[PDB]
Amino acid sequence: FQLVNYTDTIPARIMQQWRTSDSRDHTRVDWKRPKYTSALTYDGVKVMAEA
């Protein structure tokens, strides 16, 4: 089962946004093997922000 299509337009836009925010200065622990829990974390913080 798959939840996140990483190449779909709004998800790949979010992907490009955090890749650019990485490549501008720096962030924490690295990438290229993602997790769906991090996607749920991002979407839950977006839920709290919209609320």
């Epitope: 490009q16 890749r19 650019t20 990485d22 490549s23 200065d25 720096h26 962030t27 924490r28 990438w31």
Partner: single-chain antibody, 229 residues
Framework: EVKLLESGGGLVQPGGSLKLSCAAS????????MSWVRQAPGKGLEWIGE????????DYTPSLKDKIIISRDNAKKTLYLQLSKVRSEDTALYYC????????????WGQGTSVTVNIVLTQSPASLAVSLGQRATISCRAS??????????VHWYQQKPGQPPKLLIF???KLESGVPARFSGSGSRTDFTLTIDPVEADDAATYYC?????????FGGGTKLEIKR
Amino acid sequence: EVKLLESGGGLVQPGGSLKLSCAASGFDFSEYWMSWVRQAPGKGLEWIGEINPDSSSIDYTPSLKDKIIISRDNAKKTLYLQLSKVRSEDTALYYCARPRGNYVVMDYWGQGTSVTVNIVLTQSPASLAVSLGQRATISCRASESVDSYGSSFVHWYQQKPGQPPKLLIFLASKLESGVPARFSGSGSRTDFTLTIDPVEADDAATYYCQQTNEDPYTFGGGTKLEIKR
């Protein structure tokens, strides 16, 4: 593995145009960002610019915008740098590199090509001679606080004469892939320290510690390593 090869360098007349290509192999250039950085002969490095995979935002320095153009090709996985109206300051070594600000583990710099027409990071010492099989120590002092969110975003690289600076140590506590277990890093918030154990003969180069925590992204002064015999 990750491999980058630059081509098109050499000599160029003053006032003309120049196009340098950089081919990649072993990774996906259509997702990973690219960067280009110049280095004068005998001086420190200087970041020319960076470009994303989708070719939507290409950033550069504010003082070299009218003479640099960065493009890329994800189908051929090759980056292209175009320079117009070259001057006497254009005689330098350019270097194409993978995303170094983005991913510290996937940080890798290509060989580059030679073209012939406040945070203060102090290295310690300027020059030292260590024998083979020993352990050398190189210190670095920062004028401002480079610590952010618990991690010290400082990279330690080694550049030789004719060889590009390979990213040896990332984030002051992790060793890069491909390099053997012969270099470690430590320090705290004003003083960083790179240790080499054991000392080999091929490690005789110039070590540089560079921090990119905030603007401006400075580079180290350069500390040469001499192998005793």
